[PDB]
Amino acid sequence: SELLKYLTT
Amino acid sequence: SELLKYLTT
Amino acid sequence: LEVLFQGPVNALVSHLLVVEPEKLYAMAVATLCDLFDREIVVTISWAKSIPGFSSLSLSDQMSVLQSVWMEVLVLGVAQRSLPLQDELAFAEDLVLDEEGARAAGLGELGAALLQLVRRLQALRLEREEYVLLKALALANSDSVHIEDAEAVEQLREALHEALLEYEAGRRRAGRLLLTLPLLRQTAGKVLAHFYGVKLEGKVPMHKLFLEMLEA
Amino acid sequence: LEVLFQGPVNALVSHLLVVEPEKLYAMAVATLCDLFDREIVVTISWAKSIPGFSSLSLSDQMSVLQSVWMEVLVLGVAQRSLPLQDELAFAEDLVLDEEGARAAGLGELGAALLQLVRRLQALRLEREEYVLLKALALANSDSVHIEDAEAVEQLREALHEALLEYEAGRRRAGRLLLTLPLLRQTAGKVLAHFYGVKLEGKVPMHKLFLEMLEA
């Protein structure tokens, strides 16, 4: 989730 | 120690 | 990026050297929590520059990262500490001996970390070898949550092949691979220690760091 | 025995096949404790038949064994479970699915073990490859208590070389080595579970098994 946000940046 | 006994058998 | 697997390996290796994350400063258990949180961010964008990684489904990118992130952080501390003796370079401004590390609330972690460092020192690891090894550890994940096992295996294989191709420019690759079991055990010790810190609830930790500890 | 490193590798490999321990019967957490105690005994005499091992100082033989014994036991369960599906062959008369293993008081260990088993299944490990890999895991110990690091490294190297020589009769060895990190993590999970059983104090355990858990 936080991880999803940095991955899909 | 038990280990020493089986190693030195 | 995937074309780097198709040409000669020197191009791949130079790419991995170029995307190596830059030195981090830390500004004493709360220091490491802050530093580790920031290295996760850096690690995420690093992963994205690994050829093949971004071709995995997002949820598999997620699973890999959340199972290897600490292995990558720990391997970075190790490369930075290779030229030193009985000291661990956590950052440009945070070098710590075993005593220094008890005092920053790390318990026996300093000893565990120096065991890895000595094992890599014995090899005289080159910088080229390190970035291929680091990429290979990413790709050797073993998450229970991986969906396309075949895709992760295929990326693992290309990175392994790159290491082989690199070493042939010839038992040396295997010697490198035989330090991975220790890298993974050491990382799991670091994880267990900081998960213990989570439970105490004294030290505040940022969102991303908590999320990765839960996983 | 050391002469097996000097001739052709087929002789070494046949020696390792001949000294493979025979099938063990188990006669339900106390069952595994009994079985694991007996497999330590078997493992000790197995180690002694590994060329080079007996040339280590006794105290280093001790350190190696007390840091890898569970890796060898776990790798034996894995080879025995390779032809099966979602089942773990702990013994000739003790095969267990994930449910069966919760019931024998193993918690999540069945899942951990099957993760290793699937990773080796993907490789289609041969019997020859397994005994070289098992010997190599012994020699890849990383005990903190090792005195002559150079001697352990030298034995590691010969066994690694044997695997290479074997595979050349050529990325295949490395693929094998990349399952070692998971083998060691899995073994450490099994250890942690049975150390927890020690503390409860319900289940009685034999001397040797307790001694190896303490170490």
Side-chain angles (χ1 to χ4, degrees), chain A, chain B, chain C residues 1-213 215, chain D residues 1-213 215:
Chain A
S1 185
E2 275 312 297
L3 178 46
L4 180 70
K5 288 168 216 162
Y6 292 97
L7 257 173
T8 59
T9 286
Chain B
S1 185
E2 275 312 297
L3 178 46
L4 180 70
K5 288 168 216 162
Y6 292 97
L7 257 173
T8 59
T9 286
Chain C
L1 282 185
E2 267 131 81
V3 66
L4 296 175
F5 288 133
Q6 280 146 57
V9 69
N10 83 306
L12 199 226
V13 170
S14 77
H15 177 62
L16 296 176
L17 297 164
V18 166
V19 309
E20 259 307 286
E22 315 245 326
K23 321 263 142 209
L24 232 53
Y25 289 85
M27 286 83 68
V29 211
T31 310
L32 282 179
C33 289
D34 176 82
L35 181 61
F36 288 177
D37 177 88
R38 286 195 282 125
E39 281 174 328
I40 296 162
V41 175
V42 160
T43 296
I44 290 162
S45 43
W46 163 79
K48 292 156 74 175
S49 293
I50 299 311
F53 181 75
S54 298
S55 85
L56 306 183
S57 75
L58 282 183
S59 85
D60 281 354
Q61 291 177 42
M62 279 185 60
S63 304
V64 163
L65 281 164
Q66 67 194 19
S67 76
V68 305
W69 67 276
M70 182 59 81
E71 285 175 56
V72 175
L73 303 193
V74 165
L75 186 66
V77 178
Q79 178 71 354
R80 285 193 300 269
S81 312
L82 286 195
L84 320 175
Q85 167 163 113
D86 312 313
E87 303 189 315
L88 296 165
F90 289 101
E92 200 75 9
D93 64 1
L94 186 62
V95 179
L96 280 179
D97 59 322
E98 205 174 310
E99 281 170 80
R102 292 245 167 228
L106 310 195
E108 312 145 47
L109 280 192
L113 283 154
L114 291 161
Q115 201 184 356
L116 209 216
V117 167
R118 289 196 293 283
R119 183 90 195 240
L120 295 165
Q121 269 168 348
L123 283 196
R124 307 261 235 69
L125 199 69
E126 298 165 343
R127 173 129 179 107
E128 290 89 349
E129 286 180 319
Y130 163 77
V131 301
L132 293 155
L133 191 58
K134 183 157 107 103
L136 191 47
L138 174 70
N140 203 42
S141 172
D142 295 308
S143 186
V144 198
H145 308 13
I146 282 151
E147 301 293 351
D148 200 353
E150 205 188 302
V152 170
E153 190 184 79
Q154 167 178 40
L155 165 73
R156 188 198 292 138
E157 288 184 18
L159 290 158
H160 181 213
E161 176 77 355
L163 181 61
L164 295 178
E165 272 158 22
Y166 174 82
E167 289 302 355
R170 268 219 113 179
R171 182 179 342 172
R172 177 69 176 165
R175 278 164 182 178
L176 304 185
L177 303 187
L178 289 161
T179 65
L180 292 177
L182 185 53
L183 169 65
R184 159 121 31 119
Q185 159 180 51
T186 302
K189 275 158 179 181
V190 177
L191 275 169
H193 179 77
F194 281 84
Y195 196 80
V197 172
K198 189 176 153 266
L199 299 180
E200 275 174 2
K202 294 199 237 248
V203 189
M205 303 175 188
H206 299 106
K207 274 132 200 227
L208 181 61
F209 193 59
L210 284 172
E211 195 180 293
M212 303 297 270
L213 280 160
Chain D
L1 282 185
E2 267 131 81
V3 66
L4 296 175
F5 288 133
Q6 280 146 57
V9 69
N10 83 306
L12 199 226
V13 170
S14 77
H15 177 62
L16 296 176
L17 297 164
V18 166
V19 309
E20 259 307 286
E22 315 245 326
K23 321 263 142 209
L24 232 53
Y25 289 85
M27 286 83 68
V29 211
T31 310
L32 282 179
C33 289
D34 176 82
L35 181 61
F36 288 177
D37 177 88
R38 286 195 282 125
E39 281 174 328
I40 296 162
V41 175
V42 160
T43 296
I44 290 162
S45 43
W46 163 79
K48 292 156 74 175
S49 293
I50 299 311
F53 181 75
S54 298
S55 85
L56 306 183
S57 75
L58 282 183
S59 85
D60 281 354
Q61 291 177 42
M62 279 185 60
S63 304
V64 163
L65 281 164
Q66 67 194 19
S67 76
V68 305
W69 67 276
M70 182 59 81
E71 285 175 56
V72 175
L73 303 193
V74 165
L75 186 66
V77 178
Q79 178 71 354
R80 285 193 300 269
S81 312
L82 286 195
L84 320 175
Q85 167 163 113
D86 312 313
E87 303 189 315
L88 296 165
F90 289 101
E92 200 75 9
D93 64 1
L94 186 62
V95 179
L96 280 179
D97 59 322
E98 205 174 310
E99 281 170 80
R102 292 245 167 228
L106 310 195
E108 312 145 47
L109 280 192
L113 283 154
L114 291 161
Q115 201 184 356
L116 209 216
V117 167
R118 289 196 293 283
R119 183 90 195 240
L120 295 165
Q121 269 168 348
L123 283 196
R124 307 261 235 69
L125 199 69
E126 298 165 343
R127 173 129 179 107
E128 290 89 349
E129 286 180 319
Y130 163 77
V131 301
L132 293 155
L133 191 58
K134 183 157 107 103
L136 191 47
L138 174 70
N140 203 42
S141 172
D142 295 308
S143 186
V144 198
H145 308 13
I146 282 151
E147 301 293 351
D148 200 353
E150 205 188 302
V152 170
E153 190 184 79
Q154 167 178 40
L155 165 73
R156 188 198 292 138
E157 288 184 18
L159 290 158
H160 181 213
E161 176 77 355
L163 181 61
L164 295 178
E165 272 158 22
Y166 174 82
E167 289 302 355
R170 268 219 113 179
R171 182 179 342 172
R172 177 69 176 165
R175 278 164 182 178
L176 304 185
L177 303 187
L178 289 161
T179 65
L180 292 177
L182 185 53
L183 169 65
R184 159 121 31 119
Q185 159 180 51
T186 302
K189 275 158 179 181
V190 177
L191 275 169
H193 179 77
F194 281 84
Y195 196 80
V197 172
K198 189 176 153 266
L199 299 180
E200 275 173 2
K202 294 199 237 248
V203 189
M205 303 175 188
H206 299 106
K207 274 132 200 227
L208 181 61
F209 193 59
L210 284 172
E211 195 180 293
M212 303 297 270
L213 280 160

